[PDB]
Design a protein around this ligand. Sequence first.
Ligand SMILES: Cc1cc2c(=O)n(-c3ccc(F)cc3)c(=O)n(C)c2cc1C(=O)C1=C(O)CCCC1=O
Ligand SMILES: Cc1cc2c(=O)n(-c3ccc(F)cc3)c(=O)n(C)c2cc1C(=O)C1=C(O)CCCC1=O
Ligand SMILES: [Co+2]
Ligand SMILES: [Co+2]
Lengths: 379, 379
Amino acid sequence: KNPKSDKFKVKRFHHIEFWCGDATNVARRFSWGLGMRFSAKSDLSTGNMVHASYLLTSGDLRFLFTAPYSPSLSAGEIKPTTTASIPSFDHGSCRSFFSSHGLGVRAVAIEVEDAESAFSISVANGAIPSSPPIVLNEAVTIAEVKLYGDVVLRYVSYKAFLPGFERVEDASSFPLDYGIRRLDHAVGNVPELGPALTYVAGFTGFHQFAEESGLNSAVLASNDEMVLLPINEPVHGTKRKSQIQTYLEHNEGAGLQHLALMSEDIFRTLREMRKRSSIGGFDFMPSPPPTYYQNLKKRVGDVLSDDQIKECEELGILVDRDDQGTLLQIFTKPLGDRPTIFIEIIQRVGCMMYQSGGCGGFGKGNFSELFKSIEEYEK
Amino acid sequence: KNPKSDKFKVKRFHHIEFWCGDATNVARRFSWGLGMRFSAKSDLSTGNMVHASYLLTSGDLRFLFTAPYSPSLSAGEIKPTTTASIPSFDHGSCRSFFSSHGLGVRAVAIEVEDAESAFSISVANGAIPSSPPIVLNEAVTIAEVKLYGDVVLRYVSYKAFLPGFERVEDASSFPLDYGIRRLDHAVGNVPELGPALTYVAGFTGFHQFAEESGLNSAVLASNDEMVLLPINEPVHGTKRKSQIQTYLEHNEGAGLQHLALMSEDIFRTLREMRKRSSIGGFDFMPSPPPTYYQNLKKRVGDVLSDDQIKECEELGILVDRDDQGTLLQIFTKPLGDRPTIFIEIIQRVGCMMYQSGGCGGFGKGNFSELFKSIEEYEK
Ligand SMILES: Cc1cc2c(=O)n(-c3ccc(F)cc3)c(=O)n(C)c2cc1C(=O)C1=C(O)CCCC1=O
Ligand SMILES: Cc1cc2c(=O)n(-c3ccc(F)cc3)c(=O)n(C)c2cc1C(=O)C1=C(O)CCCC1=O
Ligand SMILES: [Co+2]
Ligand SMILES: [Co+2]
């Protein structure tokens, strides 16, 4: 059931912003590890005396990495005279965020028809304002409201990346590409799911998307179900400690848990990322036992050939299936020092009309399947 | 003239410690960019609830990257009960360092015969204590005194990496190597060179090493001149703004300016690093005009073949010459967001007896040679 109750016009995911202590080193690591090109910058070289911001792109996926400079460089400025290209930036907020959470997502940005209205309607419907709407060079409007923890939902709208960002030199811009194409979903961890759901669905009008693991969760979705925002809470007293609870302890509270990036060819993406795991890229979760792949034929054998199923086994890919489509997925190890944020790589097969959002779900059944497999392997 | 006045027995450079906000991402970037292997770790997986520390090695070069966890993880601990593997670590000092300076070197560590005596003699001769000597598992003693700004000189001594560090899994440890072999010199920037020299030479007994640019500098050296510690100060009012002054402004004061890493084959090192500049590695300074290489034959043509001189031209290598030997050198762009710390790659040819320290100097003459070349090119 989809009541299409969005209180304002939402388009797609626009970008994800990481708050860092050094944006250069994180962005270069992410670029090599994920195969994303350097596409725009705003920093001292572009006249920004406030923050350094570097944008990586792959397909429609946009990752932004921002860190503060010394406040001394901009001590003479006032908000009207700021050289910051993202006017919601604040030195103190950014330093406080990174010392509290470490490396993590500050902003989940969605493109909307009108960011001023989206902000107004949101706040009128209970959203906690974070940064009021501001118009950038009469071209782009940006506004922010609180989402969960210290994460904000950022609204972006264009009359016709951002003003004040320059295209970097293509000599500096090597055309890496491992097949990642867009952001599929962005997941939050909270201590209590009920209040978090009521709050976010309350101000967006997003609807609940049709669905012994250590969590309960629910998925909020926009009208066409292309903006997908799941939220998790821990379940306590399960002998095996909830991953959600471990997140909350190491992150100092609620925050973004994982980003799921859609690949146009998950096999090529994972070959390319795994080649780089030990030379600056990303590590992946432990592979499941071969039993899991020995039971895969009896479940998705009509969707994937036996060549592709053993190709899943080499790479550690998981497969799950809803009633409309099939989901191929895998998880990275945490992206930084803390066991908090990680990345999921996915590919969806089915639900063609274009592909409808959420085709195959989010891997729900792989919990019971992996537990059972573990037991079958030991035997 | 070498009076050999060291007030305690110094051996070699032992390691350089970077204080980061996220040690994982900086260490992975540095590993790929410089060709350094992951060799030891101390973090949650080794029981360290205080800081995450990752060691990279290439030849005898040891780069350590450390970041704090949430203080909440170790709130029950006291210094006697700490799980930190580096007992001088302090959450507040580290957060204050990185928010003040950004990514940079916290510790220049030298191996000494006896770290407790080195600390005592140093302090008795004017050094400002930073962390008193502490014995680690009856095996290693470590002590720290202030060097300049928020950089410390760390003394390390072994009765027979550090206790509490584990060797990482060789699956995780890819044997990268681009030819870097050891730390040659570590350079500080201060506002006033005189007081900085008097202070450091005062407590070490290091002696001044035999020597319109925007700086004055001087080099302190241990008895055998293998530990080399140059220091720079700005010269003001030169039309072209002093790089030392730009450093001091963006770094919020004194600190480490550059690390010079010796390569056993600078041509292979720079080929390998330049291949990776645009895919997560390090960028290099702008190349000099071909005029500079057109004047190189008339200066070092007896040391390098005309094939090797044009090989310098491809790679942007600089060449300078003292009276004892020749110096091949090149500089990276700054390592992080701020125009502060950078790296120099070097190779020294001459002064064999082993190679004596400082053979060829530090590139003194390349200042006038590059200015003149610039003028000859324009013509
Ligand atoms: C957060 C998460 C954890 C696991 C997980 O922990 N395991 C898992 C691994 C290893 C074992 F041994 C057992 C279970 C999984 O298989 N999957 C498929 C998982 C999927 C997700 C996930 O992507 C997600 C949610 O579940 C609810 C909100 C929507 C969403 O995006
Ligand atoms: C800090 C530094 C700057 C430059 C420099 O700025 N230039 C330079 C580039 C480009 C132009 F256009 C003009 C000069 C150089 O050539 N060299 C060779 C340089 C060498 C050093 C250096 O390594 C050093 C010192 O000079 C004194 C203390 C010992 C030490 O290690
Ligand atoms: Co997911
Ligand atoms: Co140097």
